[PDB]
């Protein structure tokens, strides 16, 4: 009736020389930028991070000009492959925020959200094309439709309806396991006994055996938007084009239809010709021009 | 380290006779002996005095490795606290330092073994108690109600096995990151690790291949002995039965075939190993873990 | 995509082609004539002498081939193909090297020489049947019905590694066509280390030998053969459990985009041979005619047997006439008449009866020596080894199986048990040995002459009793021994003086004081000739 | 300064100290530089291995710590020592400007072999904390596996472009490339392993019967596994007594050939670094039995020596000791000083140790000089101490009893290996003793079945096998030294010899000498023996004109190696005359051991042994006369009646 063995580690030696294009160095560089960069002899980002933590807003708004000024290699990396670089910068934010919060408590945070603002030259909605897929773009237009708030999971606690084996999942297309995980997971020596019983019959929990225990899970907010080109410049004899936009968490309920905005995001695709995909934008930042007070 | 329960009972009675309250530690250790080993280990690791003799070229290698590990622990702690202080973002500082830093766990820095020995009949008889742990029993009388307790058996040793190393924790090394990985083993068999699981290699995209290092690993000296009933204990018209004893640590080589002894140990279960077709439920096998030996001659 | 090439390999190929073309008081060239001979007689193999190859180019070619035969064999094959196409009009060709400068023992093989060409010697213990061996397989692709032919195996079952056409992107999915593929003959042979090569206090070694093509069915159990070929390695699953660290192989996972096939490398040394020769007319017909034309030839024939033993002329005249036998006759009704002669020498441990056995075993062509108590029923007769790793069973010869149509020597004959005595009785009555073990029946040939040496039952031969009262044998076996030579000791001054003088001469003079009329080779030639007359 | 993690070794300190010890150390010939000359001789001859007596380090002050470092961390220290030896070598060759041809030494390899690690407590007394330390063992070789190829470099080929790679093993693991390293070809997982193109090393496993000095209560013998690598393979044969130095290891084992699951309980073994095959308490191996093995040692460049070295002073002392006129009595008296008198018994033992001359006929034929002796007499004499002493002095041999043996147990058998799970052939008592002496006690209790196998051993020095799977003839070049007790209680002198010994009369004639150890009561001899025995308890430790055992063994080994007597006509005449005399004398039957040709052979062997002693190369009249006298005295025909075969207790001298 033994329990489950553990695994741990500790650093002793110095491995190979670090490379520049490795995740840990990226995180360290971003942490240095957050804690050091100066504007007008001020620690803008450290101060605003401290204030936000004091306010319970778990996010940072960062201007791309400052980053390109501080360091160009990571700027190019972030521009080229945001899907790989954004989580690294978010985990750097969370690492700094942990220390800030502990020291403040001296005198259970989630993963922080990165909000990107920009002022570079925009691109027309009619100029987006294949070359921009998965890159970062800046777009202008008018909001014409906002949807209702949806619910998505960020942490799930699940259980098996046959053998009552429990586990967890963290999100930060994830799906519930197709099979029970109590076999591959050799938890214990008596766990091997428990996985067989009543003569010769094998143990098979079935397909999709897991259920979600809702009272012990966490969820976030989600929303959809529609952006249209400004009706002044549309060509004659044609209707205006638009695009679908998705934002989450702290970028929800920020604008209302009829507002003229600047959007920074990622040009992506999804599956809904022969090999056609439907484009859309992952929102990174919203900038409003001040409408209808 | 040998822990005598007579000392515990004397301490309890000393506390009682002068008025103050105290808990029954003896019975708790007796009924659930397997959990108090680590409690005593943790308590002892909190009070060990510093060494008054320097480490020289005539010490064991294990001591050298232990001392190196402790020095490395201290160096990492000092580096972390200095780095945090230099940032400009004292109980809280040490707390945050403890939260973000790895170390070598206490089990990898111990050098001693801990055993219990039972309550003698004399002490219980003088203090008006019933020393269960030192009432001799035959293999016949030990049933499933005694599992998880500290019990004593009287018998004659029939077989003893040669001492061999039983691995407790395996060690690996990663040339990519320089970390040391430790894998606990408490089963008759285990699966070696393949790829590194440290924080640095975990966060990166190219992980390193672990290599096994025997010298850093944790081993135990293991023996298994069989004990058989005495003639005067066997009922009329029956054949004597046997029992299994496990010996670990510095207690090895203390039993030789042909000895009539009184072994002390914790009675614990083990997985079933018979024929599959005759398994009805969660059946188990029993063994004794040795803690103390006494001879009749 | 151009394939990488080894300039050295092509250089050796050209060197070998020139060697074949340019090798030569009437001068002649042997290799071209031999290629012409192969064309004439439709053969498959070429025989090349090693010294011919060695005495050229300062030995560079000979060395390169010697320590890198495995590397350069395909290039030698290509060169031979080109030469034969140029000088002569599917066929599998084999080369055969032989006459190497030196020979190795089975006890002195090292992993350094793996993949090189050497020569070894040993005694054959077992041989298997000839079986077809997959050589160049043909497969049919599954995702598409393409066909792939001429796929090489290289000591193991190999599959094609990629579809040959871009119309299909198949890989690792194939089917084997057993109808349009070729095979070669395959045999396995087990050899044993020589008796005089076993070091002090140690048991003999064994080594597996593999034969192919036209070299199969050459070795015979119980013979000594000199082999030549390559030293190779094959998997050994049995090595797990040995101490030490055993190499393992895993796939390198650096440089692969992300978002287990480990193998064990244990091996054992075997031997794949290409030339096998056994080791034991001409002008000598004149010598044979001269020697037969002697008139007292019989006296010399008798005197040249056991020259190191004093006296005992009758035993010599029996040992002779045991080497030369009668004739086997068959009756119309099916009754077969024996032609073999059996002998038994009776004496106490203080006599010299064993020396006759030792002389016979050291001299006779196919002879085996064994002891009464150091033998067994399976040691005699034969056994069945059903653990043939590749297929059906095989049978291993015993003592009586060896020396068929020869002589079997049995010392301490009076210590045989009942079962082995019945086995010898069966061999004597009918010249066959019947095996019934592991559900397998078989019949064998045991046409053998038995030379036995027995001790008296009581230690000393009581001359008051008869022959039957002084022996321990059973009536059936005792009734088939056609000669009983009982040797006793007589005290006489001149006999003792002569014996002492002879013994002291042998110790002082050694080989010098022998002077027999005829040499052992001469006796062997005479007996071989004379066993073919049928009086 | 910069230590290695886990250890306390500093590379710089260790190399500096080793260099200083190498360049300044003397044996205190004791005043000269000991290791400078050894390195010089190594380079003159070209040897590559240096044998380091670890006890030499405790003498110098600096290396008092390097000793413990070597005993605790052999892995790092041995590599450091090898590199330091090569560096010191280049320094020695260049600092004096001897010869500008130093490329070979700069390209070859060096190595150091510790061989005097401290005294241990036995393999079974070690604990888990002793893994990866330096230890030593004593034992007897039983079996050895054939050479195992062990891969070091793997050879891959690409199945689209013929590009071939080479990968070196790394702590027992091969990293197979996952992509061709070409730019033209980049196909993934296209590389195949060609085994026959790989490079392999040498490996072997030896089974050892350990013989610890201290034995706890109730401990039975066991066996150990030894791993030898590279040049040390095939350097041991079953029956050899050896001393080994190596590392104490451990390893996990796979549960089955299908899965990759390991077992928590580990398997222990030893990795060998040095083997000692010589001693000062026993004779050297007979070189006539290892002819090809020495040649193979020379071919294999293994620096293990089978025979002990001789200094010039030792040879001079040998000559002087052989030049005196009391040599025979002195040598006899040296044997077993703790045994009183028995002059002729000790002379026979010494002659057996020396042995006769081996003839080898060209074109086939073998005569051997092994000498067989049977000891019969009163039960309470000292005839088993003799067997014990001869067993402990001889290089090879097994001490067996007649009733506790069997025909199979003496010759050969088949057993299933517990590691490889296959069947293997092992050796018996009489083959393990080849080249030595086999001691058999209580020869009269051996069964006739068991005795049957001794005939071939004593009549041709060989054995034949006809068993399932094995048919071969083995060498059994071993001498027989037996003992027997009389029928009843005491040797009755009123009966013939054949009525007192429970053996067939014909068997007693195959021995070379037969001794009748009779016990007679005479007050003078009783006083002498009692005083001799009671002097041994005067002080708690022994203190008993006797040569030391080391010098005796050295002398006998030198004589056996370097002298080969040959018989002359003057000896031939006496031999024939004496043989005819024995045959005629005594000519109503089974009253005496009848003379045979074996007696003439025995005289030849004994005369050759007498000549071989005292460093003579010719056998002469005195040798034959002494041989005949010894043969007659052993059976004491002087006190025997030729007619009735009885013995007179008054004509026998103690
Ligand atoms: N000549 C002698 N020299 C020394 N000790 C002797 C002598 N004769 C007898 N002894 C003593 O008597 C005992 C003889 O017994 P042992 O030799 O074992 O019997 P055996 O060898 O005849 O079977 C020994 O213990 C020994 O100490
Ligand atoms: Mg005795
Ligand atoms: Zn389940
Ligand atoms: Zn790592
Ligand atoms: Zn295809
Ligand atoms: Zn390639």
Residue numbers in the entry:
A (entry chain D): 2 to 108, 131 to 195, 204 to 303, 320 to 340
B (entry chain 7): 78 to 166, 178 to 385
C (entry chain 6): 100 to 123, 130 to 194, 260 to 429, 443 to 463, 509 to 763
D (entry chain 4): 177 to 204, 220 to 735, 740 to 782, 786 to 852
Task: List sentences from the manuscript.
Loading of the eukaryotic replicative helicase onto replication origins involves two MCM hexamers forming a double hexamer (DH) around duplex DNA. During S phase, helicase activation requires MCM phosphorylation by Dbf4-dependent kinase (DDK), comprising Cdc7 and Dbf4. Origin activation depends upon DDK, which phosphorylates loaded DHs, rendering them competent for the recruitment of a set of firing factors.
We imaged ATP-hydrolysis-dependent DH loading on MH-capped ARS1-origin DNA, followed by the addition of the DDK kinase. Three-dimensional (3D) classification indicated that all DHs were DNA engaged, as expected for MCMs loaded onto a duplex segment capped by covalent roadblocks. After a total of two particle-polishing and eight contrast transfer function (CTF) refinement iterations in RELION39, we refined a twofold symmetric, 3.1-Å-resolution structure of DH-DNA, or 3.0-Å resolution after density modification in Phenix40. At this resolution, individual amino acidic side chains can be visualized contacting specific phosphate groups in the double helix, which allowed us to generate a comprehensive protein-DNA interaction map for the loaded helicase. We also obtained an unprecedented view of MCM ATPase centers, allowing us to correct tentative nucleotide occupancy assignments, which were based on lower-resolution data. We were, however, surprised to observe an ATP molecule harbored within the Mcm6-2 interface, given that helicase loading is impaired by an Mcm6 arginine finger mutation that is understood to block ATP hydrolysis. Our finding suggests that ADP might be released and a new ATP molecule bound to the Mcm6-2 active site—for example, after loading of a first MCM ring and before DH formation. Another possibility is that ATP binding might be affected by an amino acid change in the Mcm6 arginine finger.
